[PDB]
């Protein structure tokens, strides 16, 4: 049935979505509300170690069996984790999707979690943290979340160095049994039958309890930290609290982010439409990159500016970007630029849905958040329904709100929060 | 054969030096893999019992009769790890068959 | 409803020819977006060492203003319609592609025609982009994989126009002028060497009408009958070492001569590359990976990463492996890689051949998932094969490949062959060329 | 805060406050000591069951 | 009392860093020893950004996303 996306909710709380597009490749994704959000100070890095422990020995299939069968089929198994949630996605031929779902449910529902396996895996945890921290934007975003929130979002997406060598299989079992429950899971599938999805759902996922742990509401704190590490460039992110997922204020914040510049549309371009880029380039002759950083979650948001600049010009770059956002908040904007930002947002959303990875991730995220599928036509309709006064209100909220600054580099000329 | 197995256990002689059966079985690659899979306290107890065995054999002595390990309290600690390692090896062998 | 009927149910391409010979190809999908691009059969292989950076300069200058949209008007218009724009150039191809919405088809095709036809190259912009290109070459010099691949190309095709890099040399970049760029435009951007490829929510009738509207006047004729001509390049078995011991890791690429684009052994060689596989430190497979090279790499903790490549040009190719490791494992990984190559050459296995065939099937379909890779494949296929090879034909060739012809093709292309070796970094433990040859033939076979 | 005794030199040497006037730590609970080595009386505890183990099936 | 040693009682050796160029006649107490601290893993060097066109697109604009795979390299999306 390629005409519509089949959608249903099991009585236990599970959500089953399936589209029969008759594609040559079929994908199965289980979306679990078990990210780094749901850890307190006693079991930090548990989500990271679980994410790398997604190919271990399980009650029903060994680790050797899992990896040999997956690579003999030729399909791929991957884990995509955000702070809110993880997603276990397996992709392969339509013929072997039954064996792929057997492996996927065996590794996501009943893991054995042997202590020697995680003892061997903590070195890979350290190596993966180093590889992810090879670029400085990861460290800047981690520090920005750490200084923006007090709990449940200051938790790093990567394991702390002290927690390496300390996470145990009992902690992994506790995390899995507390957060991998049926009301927090959504099983979506592209190129698979709804009957097969429901059959494997009632075969495997019926044994879970319910809502599990609640959370911590992610109270905001604000503040600033500045890490001097002597890079050639200086990174600085200045954010403030914004709306959560599912709000017209959040849609206005996304429109404002694409107005101020969410990235380049031309290889080696000048970013003529990007107001932040134009304002910074007006008073500089050095390499730089300024953009609008937007990140919404279940109950909180973070909107702000991200500046990569030189050590000497960091102050003027940050001041020019902040003054541009302040001018937008005061109301120096035209309806044509708002329409261009709306067109950019609609195009970016459509190109996200365009591929199968983005389509599966979008339907899984919608299944977790809203519990029902929202059509791209309706998404573009509400994006068009965003008004410019809402953009002005969101910019005023960012300007007047308390700030969170994460800086890194050679910080001799980078201004502080009170200097802005 | 409870009495006969007890008699053969006493006549084997490794109960005289305070060993265990799983202590005294020879180290093949699977056995070393399962020893690596042993937990901390069991590994330390195993290594101390082996060290006492070396010391007693060097001195040409045995433990006292009350300190001899008994057939009723001979724990088989390394056995489930050994069976799991054997199962993994057999599974790798049949995948090499296929 | 299985794989065969799914591949047949994948919609076919549609190819048309204009009056000037420009190829216009499109694939219609159900998406609301489209990828419209222009592929030009030009590159460093066509460059003649006088204008060795002309294509790189032209792709830098293509979006910096035209005759009808001077300065930043083109960038402003494409960002106002919200379309993402990209360009690249490999040693045989030059692509200018735009991801856009389906409703903006006349605008995107007018922008593409104006980019590839009426580009204006002001001298101030040429000087600014010359400085930009020099700084970007310094950045690429700081990158390490690109240096090794350029070294491999140079030492493999020395004395031929395929050894020269895409960017060209720094002196040539400093000394090119507007006259050389205009000569390159008037010599290599001919009508029948360009494919206008559209993928996604595009109607082929509308695309053909728009191409007839805009790309009708390209003037394919040459100015003084100065018709260029492709010539085969001579593969030279050789080695280049760039020892710089201050680098933390060492990159080594070992390759042999490939079959070319039109040769039907590409499918078999790609299957063999799937047998060898690839590995990175962030891989979750660990020791129990199916690839034995990856398994022994994890078991002995030798390499940081390795990958296998099969780069193909017109009756020419570089086929081999690139691996980065530390200074204490280069000999071990060369020995293991050569052992796996000759294990494929001597003793193939039906089970691993089936595994590699499944790997290549999934890789092909997963890559062709997406309108931008579909448009890329359409442009590259019409430039190279002269036609778009369908997924059913690819699956038929995969089913045709088995272990016996895999063994034959591997023994034909790997066994007893002089390689091209490019090493960069702490490569003192990299084995001698005679040792590499001695590993490239077995004494038990 | 100034002086604390030294075991090897057998003299009152210099130290900080935290090891002079609070040589006892800030641990919450005094942990138990080690096992009694070379004991005359030994009481072995039964682990699981002997009839549950010793099964080669 | 115009010195931090006489101003901060217990915090004087914390606020003051003392190191001797040559060994004294009297040994100190709490000599200290580095317990063979571990080494960070070696990694391939990342390219720098010497121009605005290469620096463009490096600024983060989305929530941080980690991705691991069985046979796919890990990716961090900004």
TrEMBL record, chain B:
Superkingdom classification of source: Eukaryota
Record GO biological process: mitochondrial electron transport, ubiquinol to cytochrome c
Coiled coil (UniProt feature): none
Record's bilayer topology term: Peripheral membrane protein
Keyword tags: Electron transport, Membrane, Mitochondrion, Mitochondrion inner membrane, Respiratory chain, Transport
GO terms, molecular function: protein-containing complex binding
InterPro entries associated with the record: QCR7, QCR7_sf
GO cellular component, one term: respiratory chain complex III
Membership in a protein family: Belongs to the UQCRB/QCR7 family.
Oligomeric and partner information: Component of the ubiquinol-cytochrome c oxidoreductase (cytochrome b-c1 complex, complex III, CIII), a multisubunit enzyme composed of 11 subunits. The complex is composed of 3 respiratory subunits cytochrome b, cytochrome c1 and Rieske protein UQCRFS1, 2 core protein subunits UQCRC1/QCR1 and UQCRC2/QCR2, and 6 low-molecular weight protein subunits UQCRH/QCR6, UQCRB/QCR7, UQCRQ/QCR8, UQCR10/QCR9, UQCR11/QCR10 and subunit 9, the cleavage product of Rieske protein UQCRFS1.
Record-given protein name: Cytochrome b-c1 complex subunit 7
Annotated source species: Mus musculus
């Amino acid at each position: 049935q390629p005409q519509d996306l089949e959608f249903t909710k099991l009585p236990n709380g599970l959500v089953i979505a399936s589209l029969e597009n008759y594609a040559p490749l079929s994908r199965i994704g289980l979306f679990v509300k078990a990210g780094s959000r749901y850890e307190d100070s006693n079991n930090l890095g548990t989500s990271h170690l679980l994410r790398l422990a997604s190919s271990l020995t399980t009650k029903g299939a060994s680790s050797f069996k899992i990896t040999r069968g997956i690579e003999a089929v030729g399909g791929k198994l991957s884990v995509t984790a955000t702070r809110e949630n993880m997603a276990y996605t397996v992709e392969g031929i339509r013929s072997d999707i039954e064996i792929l779902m057997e492996f996927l449910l065996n590794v996501t529902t009943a893991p054995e979690f042997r202590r020697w396996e995680v003892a061997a895996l903590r070195s890979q945890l350290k190596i993966d943290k180093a590889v992810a921290f090879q670029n400085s934007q990861t460290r800047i975003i981690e520090n920005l979340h750490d200084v923006a929130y007090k709990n449940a979002l200051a938790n790093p997406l990567y394991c702390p160095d002290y927690r390496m060598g300390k996470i145990t299989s009992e902690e992994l079992h506790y995390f899995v049994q507390n957060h991998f429950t049926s009301a927090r899971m959504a099983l979506v599938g592209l190129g698979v039958s709804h009957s097969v999805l429901k059959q494997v759902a009632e075969q495997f996922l019926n044994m879970r309890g319910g809502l599990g742990l609640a959370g911590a509401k992610a109270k905001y704190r604000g503040g600033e930290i500045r890490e001097q590490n002597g890079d050639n460039l200086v990174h600085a992110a200045i954010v403030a609290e914004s709306a959560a997922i599912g709000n017209a204020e959040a849609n206005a914040f996304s429109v404002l982010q694409h107005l101020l510049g969410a990235g380049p549309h031309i290889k080696r371009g000048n970013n003529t439409t990007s107001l932040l880029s134009q304002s910074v380039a007006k008073g500089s002759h050095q390499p730089f990159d300024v953009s609008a950083f937007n990140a919404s979650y279940s109950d909180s948001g973070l909107f702000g500016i991200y500046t990569i600049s030189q050590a000497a010009a960091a102050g003027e770059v940050i001041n020019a970007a902040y003054n541009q956002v302040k001018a937008v908040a005061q109301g120096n904007l035209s309806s044509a630029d708002v329409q261009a930002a709306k067109n950019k947002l609609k195009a970016g959303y459509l190109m996200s849905v365009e591929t199968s990875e983005g389509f599966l991730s979008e339907i899984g995220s919608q299944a977790l958040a809203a519990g029902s599928y929202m059509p791209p036509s309706t998404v573009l309709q509400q994006i068009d329904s965003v008004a410019d006064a809402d953009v002005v209100k969101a910019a005023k909220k960012f300007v007047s709100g308390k700030k969170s600054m994460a800086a890194s580099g050679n910080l001799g000329h980078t201004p502080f929060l009170d200097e802005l | 054969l409870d009495g006969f197995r007890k008699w053969y256990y006493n006549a084997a002689g490794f109960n005289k030096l305070g060993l265990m059966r799983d202590d005294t079985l020879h180290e093949t690659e699977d056995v070393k893999e399962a020893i690596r899979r042993l937990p901390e306290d069991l590994y330390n107890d195993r290594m101390f019992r082996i060290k006492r065995a070396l010391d007693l054999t060097m001195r040409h002595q045995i433990l006292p009769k009350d300190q001899w390990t008994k057939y009723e309290e001979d724990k088989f600690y390394l056995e489930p790890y050994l069976k799991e390692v054997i199962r993994e090896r057999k599974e790798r062998e049949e995948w090499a068959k296929k | 409803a299985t794989f065969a009927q799914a591949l047949q149910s994948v919609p076919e391409t549609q190819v048309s020819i204009l009056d000037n010979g420009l190829r216009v190809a499109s694939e219609q999908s159900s998406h609301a977006t489209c990828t419209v691009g222009v592929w030009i059969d030009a590159g460093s292989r066509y460059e003649t060492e006088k204008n060795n950076g002309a294509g790189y300069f032209l792709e830098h200058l293509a979006f910096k203003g035209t005759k009808n949209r001077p300065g930043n008007a083109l960038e402003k218009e494409v960002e106002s319609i919200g379309a993402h724009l990209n360009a690249y150039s490999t040693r045989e191809h030059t692509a200018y592609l735009i991801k856009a919405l389906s409703k903006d088809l006349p605008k995107v095709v007018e922008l593409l025609a104006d980019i590839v036809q009426n580009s204006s190259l002001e001298d101030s912009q040429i000087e600014k982009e010359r400085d930009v290109i020099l700084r970007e070459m310094q950045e690429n010099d700081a990158s390490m994989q690109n240096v090794v691949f350029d070294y491999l190309h140079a030492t493999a095709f020395q004395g031929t126009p395929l050894a020269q890099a895409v960017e060209g040399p720094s002196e040539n970049v400093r000394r090119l002028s507007r006259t050389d760029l205009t000569d390159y435009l008037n010599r290599h951007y001919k009508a029948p060497r360009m494919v206008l490829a559209a993928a996604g929510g595009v109607e082929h009738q509308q695309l053909l009408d728009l191409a007839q509207k805009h790309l009708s006047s390209v003037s394919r004729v040459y100015e003084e009958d100065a018709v260029p001509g492709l010539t085969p390049c001579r593969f030279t078995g050789s080695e280049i070492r760039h020892r710089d011991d201050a680098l933390p890791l060492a990159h080594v690429a070992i390759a042999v001569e490939g079959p070319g684009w039109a040769n039907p052994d590409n499918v078999t060689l790609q299957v063999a590359n799937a047998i060898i596989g690839h590995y990175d430190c962030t891989y979750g497979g660990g020791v129990h990976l199916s690839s034995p090279l990856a398994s022994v790499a994890v078991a002995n903790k030798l390499c940081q990463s390795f990958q296998t490549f099969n780069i193909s040009y017109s009756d020419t190719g570089l086929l081999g492996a690139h691996f980065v490791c530390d200074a204490m494992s280069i000999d071990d990984m060369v020995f293991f890689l050569q052992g796996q190559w000759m294990r494929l050459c001597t003793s193939a296995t039906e089970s691993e051949v089936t595994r590699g065939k499944n790997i290549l099937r999934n890789a092909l379909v997963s890559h062709l998932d997406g309108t931008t890779p579909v448009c890329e494949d359409i442009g590259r296929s019409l430039l190279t094969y002269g036609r778009r090879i369908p997924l059913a034909e690819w699956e038929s060739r995969i089913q045709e490949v088995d272990a016996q012809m895999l063994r034959d093709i591997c023994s034909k292309y790997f066994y007893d062959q002089c390689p091209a070796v490019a090493g960069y970094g702490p490569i003192e433990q990299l084995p001698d060329y005679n040792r590499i040859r001695s590993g490239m033939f077995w004494l038990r076979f | 805060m100034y002086y604390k005794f030294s075991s090897f030199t057998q003299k009152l040497a210099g130290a900080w406050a935290s090891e002079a006037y609070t040589p006892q730590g800030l641990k919450p609970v005094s942990x138990x000591x080690x096992x009694x080595x070379x004991x005359x009386x030994x009481x072995x505890x039964x682990x699981x069951x002997x009839x549950x183990x010793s099964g080669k099936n | 009392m115009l010195s931090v040693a006489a101003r901060s009682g217990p915090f004087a050796p914390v606020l003051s860093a003392t190191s001797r160029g040559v060994a004294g006649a009297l040994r100190p107490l709490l000599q200290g020893a580095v317990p063979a601290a571990s080494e960070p893993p070696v990694l391939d060097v990342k390219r720098p950004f010497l121009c605005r066109e290469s620096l463009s697109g490096q600024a983060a604009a989305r929530p941080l996303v980690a991705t691991v795979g069985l046979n796919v390299p890990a990716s961090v999306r900004f």
